[PDB]
Design a protein around this ligand. Structure first.
Ligand code: FES
Ligand SMILES: [Mg+2]
Ligand SMILES: [Mg+2]
Ligand SMILES: [Mg+2]
Ligand SMILES: [Mg+2]
Ligand SMILES: [Mg+2]
Ligand SMILES: [Mg+2]
Ligand SMILES: [Mg+2]
Ligand SMILES: [Mg+2]
Ligand SMILES: [Mg+2]
Ligand SMILES: [Mg+2]
Ligand SMILES: [Mg+2]
Ligand SMILES: [Mg+2]
Ligand SMILES: [Mg+2]
Ligand SMILES: [Mg+2]
Ligand SMILES: [Mg+2]
Lengths: 48, 23, 72, 137, 128, 122, 74, 85, 116, 96
RNA sequence: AGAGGAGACAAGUCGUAACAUGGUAAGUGUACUGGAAAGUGCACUUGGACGAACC
RNA sequence: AAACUCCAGUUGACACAAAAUAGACUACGAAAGUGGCUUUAACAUAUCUGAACACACAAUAGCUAAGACCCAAACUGGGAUUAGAUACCCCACUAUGCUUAGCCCUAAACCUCAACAGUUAAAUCAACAAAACUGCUCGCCAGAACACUACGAGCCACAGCUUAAAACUCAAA
């Protein structure tokens, strides 16, 4: 199962072919790892 | 405990070192 | 005791009964004790599934007219 | 609104003002309170010196420098000079835990300067240089 | 050393691993894994080469082979870190433990002891 | 192993940033890494002033490069990022998702220690 | 002290004796001095509370054991 | 290298400089900065530092346990219910 | 409360000791006395104002009357506040309880580091 | 034998062990918003476990993540990031 | 045989090093220095203490 | 007081040094030791004890050779104190602390509590300390002082380290 999942993932990897397209897509996109926690243990996502 | 034995050994060692330095 | 698991589940589900314990009356039956008695009666009737037995106990007590307000 | 002890942040829109000046523009009063001295320098937000006063500059000498009284006198002198130069409100930044850490501030208030904020800038190394050896007393 | 293209010990016995992408083979190879995976592959190779039962790990032979692999790893580590006293001690203690294990194996099973010595290239020398 | 290169690049226009990212990923591939994803965290003011290649940076563009590289390529990539001028600061870590989170039942209470001193009368 | 009055009343009603106050040192092992050479010590001591007010055994337990007085006790 | 007028800064409320300085000192004390500065005036040798830390940890344990006992028994400070017996 | 498990040097404790107390970690049946706070010189600011006015006015009391009166009022307030502070310490309202009453309470419920 | 005698079994009334607020959640050095919840607003000092309330494992994870973020340019060292001053207060400490 | 060391004998002389926080806590290793006990640096030990709720 | 005023204060640039808070955690290592971050290698033994006849380590200090040098600091010099002050207090600076390559191999190297397995039963237990024990094994001990000494021997150590006595003396220690 892990090998099958890895084979599925490999399709989306950055190669020397789609390097420029993926770089442009990354520049256009944004990734947020920020989220706060509450005293009750609930995650609070940013307002984006 | 007290350090009387340690003090005796300390004086012995100090005097021995000074004797070695002298001679 | 065997009834202790039933009592703990009852306290977790319906919370402490709004009826007040009267520890001076030796024949006092708390709402939890009534639940335990009904559960034991139904278990003697052949039912074995714990969740189904609990649900039937709650439904029977509600039908008899017992107030059983779940904590959630 | 509710008063906040946190200072306003540069780059953020803040309604707080002091004589029409933003928090980023208020002059800064640096109070170095050493164990034997207290020095107070008033500078502009653009880092232009305006006044300077230390316990030594007030005629206090030797152990008399490291007292609350000398620091208060230095604060009064520095505040007077700053007010002569046109300073009204100040952001106080104090470094050191000398006797003149607080009294000097009082002197500024006695001199006629309003303290809008107080900041501690005491140099606390994260285990950098090694200080001198412990005294035997 | 095993070739870097060698698959990991866990992934070499999954069906159809030869039909996966070359990138997948790289990921599951010893190239994209730490040195301990290479040590495990070496241990498996030595077991298949020497011991009668490759699936037995509690036997004295399996312990000797594993300790030999650990000793080789320690020597390779010390060749680069010549001032690593902790690993020097580990190497010396492992050498002594392997000598003890070889003494026990020689006392118990001599033919298997000879097979161990030949396969692992151990020259068992009696202590002075 | 699986590594994550956290990269802070000099705040530049889009062509320069794209060229720098392409150069970095190409260097990773040349050293043997298989790049899996490039995640942009955006451009933000740095928490503190950074002096890199005789230039003080107040803002930087944050990116992540998840990849699988042989253990020997990490040192070479660190050297390459050190030599680069467009990189304010680059740090390669082991990928956090690799380390699986062991389940925690809960905070086990610590009872007060007992029998630390003899029960003889004092 | 919650039951001192009740125990004293019970002892008076039954004709026996009570001690619900601070047990002075020697009321049993030194009775011949405190009371007199002809004092008669109890032949049975009943503790309705074997612990003193600091959660230690009542000294009268040990003293009655010394004086060979059987002790009934809750 | 960090921004200024963010760390260890307390805004004065209506010219109450006394209270602002008290709050700043309380913040520094609770964060332990004041004790750190005082101990960093002269170098504390590692053996002395370990001895001080051990003494302070034992003191903290004892003080917390004594406070717990005092709070536990404080309810028993009420009036004597069996006065005279 | 900080843990004590495996801290002290004891038999069966494999690790080196964490704590090395010079006294046994056993609760005493008494608390420390109500420690006095070392008095600081008071009314220094008003004294400074008065003395500066004296220096400016050549120590002429007529000109400095206001500051002199302020300093005198501060001195009287300080003395009366010291007396009131002694009264408050006798009262014990500021603390949760006086050390004497706390010692009485601990006497009622003593620590038992022994068997009986 | 006797039916009314007690039976050996686990404590049915035992409440589940209290879980730290971060139990089961991944702590990452890039999550500066979360890490800022455990640092002093004024001095940037990492709060102790008696303040945060986290277990030992999560306290160590938070500490290492904060150090990594501070050294790698994700997090300020001498103060809490002002953008995170209004985040939920999960630390048992009051200065005022 | 000129001398060194130890112990006893016990004086007088110069200080007061240790025993109390012994008035600079004591001590170990080591290095340097000093009329002399000894002093100081560096690391270590408690065979010291830190007064033991808050203040 | 001496000393520095090419000094002090702000701002900016700025390290072969040291690693606040976390740490109220008690983890790793055989011990010595190890509390900034990242990566690589990596933390012996599927019975236990076992080398002082070996092998490998061993804080700090110290030697040798080449570098770094912010800060600290033996020695030294100056100021002060003192009857004196070869110290405590203040100032300046060096060896040294750091890096690399070898040495030296000592500590109150002590948690003065050996390794392994087990017990809490009692007859628990001189005192204090950190409760009393059992089985097994190794190492050590046999009045004080002479004595961490002399001689002999070994060592890269040459005013050294390890092993280590005896004579005279006392009724104690
Ligand atoms: S409470 Fe679950 S890991 Fe801390
Ligand atoms: Mg002698
Ligand atoms: Mg003396
Ligand atoms: Mg002394
Ligand atoms: Mg010394
Ligand atoms: Mg000297
Ligand atoms: Mg062994
Ligand atoms: Mg060494
Ligand atoms: Mg130097
Ligand atoms: Mg210097
Ligand atoms: Mg000096
Ligand atoms: Mg360094
Ligand atoms: Mg040690
Ligand atoms: Mg020696
Ligand atoms: Mg010798
Ligand atoms: Mg010889």
């Amino acid at each position: 199962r892990e090998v099958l999942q890895l084979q599925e993932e490999v399709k989306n990897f950055i190669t020397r072919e789609n390097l420029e397209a993926r770089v442009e897509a990354a520049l256009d996109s944004r990734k947020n790892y920020n989220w706060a926690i509450t005293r009750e243990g609930l995650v609070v996502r940013p307002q984006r | 405990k007290n350090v009387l034995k340690i003090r005796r050994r300390k004086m012995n060692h100090h005097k021995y070192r000074k004797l070695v330095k002298k001679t | 005791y065997h009834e202790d698991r039933i009592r703990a589940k009852f306290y977790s589900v319906y919370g402490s009964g709004q009826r007040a314990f009267d520890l001076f009356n030796p024949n006092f039956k708390s709402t939890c004790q009534r639940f335990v008695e009904k559960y034991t009666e139904l278990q003697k009737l052949g039912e074995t599934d714990e969740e189904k037995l609990f649900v039937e106990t709650g439904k029977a007590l509600l039908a008899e007219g017992v107030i059983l307000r779940r904590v959630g | 609104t509710k008063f906040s002890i946190y200072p306003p942040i540069p780059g953020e829109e803040s309604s707080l003002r002091w004589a029409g000046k933003k928090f980023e523009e208020i002059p800064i009063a640096h109070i170095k309170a050493s164990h034997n001295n207290t020095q107070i320098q008033v500078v502009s937000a653009s880092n232009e010196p305006l006044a300077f006063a230390s316990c030594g500059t007030e005629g206090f000498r030797n152990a008399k420098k490291g007292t609350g009284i000398a620091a208060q006198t230095a604060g009064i002198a520095a505040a007077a000079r700053a007010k002569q130069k046109g300073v009204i409100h100040i952001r106080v930044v104090v470094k050191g835990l000398g006797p003149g850490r607080l009294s000097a501030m009082h002197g500024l208030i006695m001199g006629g300067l309003e303290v809008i904020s107080i900041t501690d800038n005491t140099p606390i190394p994260h285990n950098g240089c090694r200080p001198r050896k412990a005294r035997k007393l | 050393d095993p070739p870097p293209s060698t698959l990991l010990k866990d992934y070499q016995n999954v069906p159809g691993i030869e039909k996966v992408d070359d990138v997948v083979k790289r990921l599951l190879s010893l190239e994209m894994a730490n040195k301990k995976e290479m040590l495990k592959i070496k241990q498996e190779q030595f077991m298949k080469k020497i011991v009668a039962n490759p699936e037995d790990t509690r036997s004295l032979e399996a312990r000797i082979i594993a300790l030999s692999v650990k000793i080789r790893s320690y020597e390779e580590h010390l060749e680069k870190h010549r001032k690593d006293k902790a690993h020097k001690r580990y190497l010396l203690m492992s050498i002594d433990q392997r000598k003890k294990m070889l003494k026990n194996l020689r006392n118990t099973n001599y033919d298997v002891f000879e097979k161990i010595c030949w396969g692992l290239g151990i020259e068992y020398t009696f202590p002075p | 192993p699986r590594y994550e290169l956290a990269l802070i690049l000099k705040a530049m226009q889009r062509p320069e940033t794209a060229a720098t990212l392409k150069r970095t990923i190409e260097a990773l591939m040349d050293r043997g890494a298989i790049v899996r994803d490039l995640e942009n965290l955006g451009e933000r003011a740095l928490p503190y002033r950074i002096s890199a290649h005789s230039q003080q940076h107040n803002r930087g563009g944050y990116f992540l490069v998840d990849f699988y590289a042989p253990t020997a390529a990490v040192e070479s990539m660190v050297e390459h990022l050190s030599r680069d001028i467009d990189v304010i600061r680059g740090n390669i870590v082991k990928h956090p998702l690799t380390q699986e989170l062991k389940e925690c039942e809960g905070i086990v209470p610590v009872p007060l220690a007992e029998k630390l001193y003899s029960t003889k009368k004092r | 002290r919650q039951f001192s009055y009740l125990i004293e009343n019970m002892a008076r009603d039954c004709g026996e004796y009570a001690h619900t106050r601070y047990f002075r040192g020697g009321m049993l092992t030194n009775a011949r001095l405190l009371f007199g050479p002809t004092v008669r010590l109890p032949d049975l001591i009943i503790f309705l509370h074997t612990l003193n007010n600091i959660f230690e055994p009542h000294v009268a337990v040990r003293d009655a054991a010394k004086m060979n007085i059987p002790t009934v006790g809750i | 290298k960090h921004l200024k007028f963010i760390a260890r800064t307390v805004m004065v409320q209506e010219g109450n400089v006394e209270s602002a300085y008290r709050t700043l000192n309380r913040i520094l004390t609770m964060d332990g900065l004041i004790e750190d500065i005082k101990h960093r005036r002269y170098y504390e040798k590692p053996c002395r530092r370990r001895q001080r830390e051990s003494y302070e940890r034992c003191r903290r344990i004892y003080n917390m346990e004594m406070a717990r006992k005092i709070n536990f028994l404080m309810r028993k400070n009420r009036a004597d219910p069996w006065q005279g017996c | 409360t900080p843990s004590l498990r495996g801290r002290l040097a004891r038999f069966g404790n494999p690790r080196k000791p964490v704590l090395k107390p010079n006294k046994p970690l056993i609760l005493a049946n008494r608390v420390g006395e109500r420690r006095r706070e070392k008095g600081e010189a008071t009314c220094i600011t008003e004294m400074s104002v008065m003395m500066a006015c004296w220096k400016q006015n050549e120590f002429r009391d007529d000109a400095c009357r206001k500051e002199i009166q302020g300093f005198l009022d501060c001195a009287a307030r300080a003395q009366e506040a010291r007396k009131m502070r002694s009264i408050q310490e006798t009262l014990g309202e500021s603390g949760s309880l006086l050390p004497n009453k706390l010692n009485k309470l601990l006497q009622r419920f003593p620590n038992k580091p022994y068997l009986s | 034998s006797n039916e009314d005698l007690p039976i050996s079994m686990e404590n049915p009334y035992k409440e589940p062990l209290k879980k730290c607020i971060l139990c089961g959640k991944h702590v990452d050095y890039k999550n500066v918003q979360l890490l800022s919840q455990f640092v002093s607003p004024f001095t940037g000092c990492i709060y102790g476990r008696h303040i945060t309330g986290l277990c030992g494992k999560k306290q160590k994870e938070i500490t290492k993540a904060i150090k990594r973020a501070q050294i790698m340019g994700f997090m300020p060292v001498t103060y809490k990031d002002p953008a995170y001053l209004k985040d939920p207060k999960v630390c048992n400490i009051r200065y005022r």
